[PDB]
Design a protein around this ligand. Structure first.
Ligand code: HEM
Ligand code: NA
Ligand code: ZN
Length: 187
């Protein structure tokens, strides 16, 4: 898990809970004097432990917290990698380019990142079938990231998530409906 994910998580926790809470989280779930260098890899368990702690503190379902983080995370990534996101002029283009363009770039930007396998298929009625697979099973982070991407393009979406690794499948199917964006008028 790359430090950049931890850095954006810090921004979120500091904004919601305060720096005092982040320092508690860091002291408890990470070794002494831990500093997350953006490009460096760290144990994903450190991230999960922190996020689980946050969920418990807020009395929220863990997957709702991960989804919220995902949405916050897209802007964190877009602002740190503006050149990557500026490759796309709309939401649908970006989603279809997650695997072959965005995460391909991430492999050039970072040393041996741990990334999901994603494949998007354009459907009728302005829908996208996004197939997600990963041993980390962060499909709800993916959901959040998609809502973040929609927000980035001033678009509105809905997601159906009825095939899921957490309900026993070896992949998740995220069915994305584009309800509105700047090029969508009546239909
Ligand atoms: C809707 C858009 C996106 C989706 C659905 C998505 C999906 C994901 C997910 C779910 C993860 C967690 C790892 C896993 O599931 O195995 C991940 C990791 C990551 N993604 Fe994306 N992502 C999106 C956009 C971006 C963008 C715009 C960037 C940067 C330009 C980016 C760079 C990264 C990086 C650096 C990691 C961490 C890799 C590691 O820790 O080794 N992603 N992505
Ligand atoms: Na519109
Ligand atoms: Zn899932």
């Amino acid at each position: 898990m790359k430090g950049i994910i931890f850095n954006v998580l810090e921004d979120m926790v500091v904004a919601q809970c305060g720096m005092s809470v982040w320092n508690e989280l860091l002291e408890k779930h990470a070794p002494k004097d831990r500093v997350y260098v953006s490009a460096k890899s760290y144990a994903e368990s450190e991230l999960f432990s922190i996020v689980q702690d946050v969920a418990q503190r807020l009395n929220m379902p863990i997957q709702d917290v991960v989804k919220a983080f995902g949405q916050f995370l897209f802007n964190g990534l877009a602002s740190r990698h503006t050149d990557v996101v500026d490759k796309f002029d709309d939401f649908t283009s970006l989603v279809m380019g997650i695997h072959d363009v965005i995460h391909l770039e991430v492999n050039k930007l970072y040393h041996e990142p741990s990334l999901p396998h994603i494949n998007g298929q354009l459907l009728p009625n302005n829908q996208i079938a996004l197939r997600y697979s990963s041993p980390r099973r962060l499909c709800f982070c993916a959901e959040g990231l998609l809502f973040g991407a929609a927000q980035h393009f001033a678009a509105a979406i809905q997601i159906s998530h009825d095939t899921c690794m957490h309900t026993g499948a070896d992949h998740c199917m995220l069915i994305i409906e584009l309800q509105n964006d700047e090029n969508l008028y009546f239909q």
